[PDB]
Amino acid sequence: STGSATTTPIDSLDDAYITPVQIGTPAQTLNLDFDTGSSDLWVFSSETTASEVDGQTIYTPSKSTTAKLLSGATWSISYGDGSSSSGDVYTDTVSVGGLTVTGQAVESAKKVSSSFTEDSTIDGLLGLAFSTLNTVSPTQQKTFFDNAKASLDSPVFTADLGYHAPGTYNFGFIDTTAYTGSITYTAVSTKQGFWEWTSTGYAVGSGTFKSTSIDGIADTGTTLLYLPATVVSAYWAQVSGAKSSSSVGGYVFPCSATLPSFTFGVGSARIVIPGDYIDFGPISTGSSSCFGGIQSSAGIGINIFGDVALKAAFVVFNGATTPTLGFASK
Ligand SMILES: N=C(N)c1ccc(C(F)(F)F)cc1
Structure with missing residues (x-):
């Protein structure tokens, strides 16, 4: 079926x-x-x-x-x-x-x-x-x-x-018509009950790719992309006027900005999140301060590849005896 x-x-x-x-x-x-x-x-x-x-x-x-x-x-x-x-x-x-x-x-x-x-x-x-x-x-x-x-x-x-x-x-x-290229599969740990996997790194905008292991979960029920503070700082440093606001509860940026893309690694493959996917709009109605879609996972205890990341991909949740995760561009 x-x-x-x-x-x-x-x-x-x-x-x-x-x-x-x-x-x-x-x-x-x-x-x-x-x-x-x-x-x-x-x-x-x-x-x-x-x-x-x-x-x-x-x-x-x-x-x-x-x-x-x-x-x-x-x-x-x-x-x-x-x-x-x-x-x-x-x-x-x-x-x-x-x-x-x-x-x-x-x-x-x-x-x-x-x-x-x-x-x-x-x-x-x-x-x-x-x-x-x-x-x-x-x-x-x-x-x-x-x-x-x-x-x-x-x-x-x-x-x-x-x-x-x-x-x-x-x-x-x-559905082999729903994605472009090939699907890259990656190992899953089920030890915390999540679809937990390890990204191979990231890039900000047109910048060079940083090879680094980032463990996190594929989570359709989380809106945003929550990553280590180092990675998040590197992203928002490329946006003039962006800042972490303790009173708002994360990174905000001028609503006049054009955001850079964010790339994450899946094995040797790369998924590109366009900058517009990272704009969550005014912090309050009419404000010119906008809420960012990439936020720090510090204090959560886990990195979360939420909707901001997943919506840039076609994602396979493979529930075979040894589960795995697949990602393709689309
Ligand atoms: N229901 C979910 N998608 C969810 C995922 C992760 C957490 C965390 F472990 F980070 F708290 C909490 C809730």
Whole structure:
């Protein structure tokens, strides 16, 4: 089997991407944030505290003839930004782009933090990291990909995120028309539960490539590119007037600037992030200070190849017995 679904930016900045997901019988379609940095499929629901729902589409298990309470199971998760959610668990039928999994754990939110409430465009998360990160207790649950894998034509999914435009998530096949050149594969460590790999270096603009190992995760659920402070300083030093602002929370730059590209290495291959992908717009409405798309990972504890990097590539998440990651230009 295979599946193919379009993913759509939630706003004009590509702050996140949503993909429609069918849950239950008859189907309930929710727009979920596919997150290769976590491993829970959770949804706004008829169980979510009413005052914490503001425009989201909710899953109502009682309206689904295939929903079953997973008795005794609960979940609770925290994300990079301090946001969180928690609740109880149902199993139900879940389909993504024509690919169906029966018996999928659907984590129903009883509680969500304010940042979720405040974002009406995201109805929940669909985690695509390794199932060892799943938070369900006392019986950990498998991700949608994990459950689907044995039915797939090939045990892979691909992320093809757009810059200010829709893109695609495919399951079970590699669309050889969606990229240019060849795919370069690179080793993955699953020891922290992430799609963790080592970039071979970077370049800023038209500058020379610096060969240096940069360990980090391929994370569709993180907006920005978070790299070591040395690398980030070298990038922003090429932008007149750019500065790290402790009050804003990172590097800012004049909105009048033309940003340089940023290149990262994948083995002997190179992925070029155009400068415009690194512009996250005014820090506040009407400001002439703009927020940068490359930020320091110092204090996070890990480097994160988030959407700013991934959207410059066609990315293969290869879930074979020894997982690997592939990157191609497009
Ligand atoms: N995409 C995610 N859900 C995510 C959240 C937190 C981190 C960490 F805190 F570890 F950096 C990394 C990834």
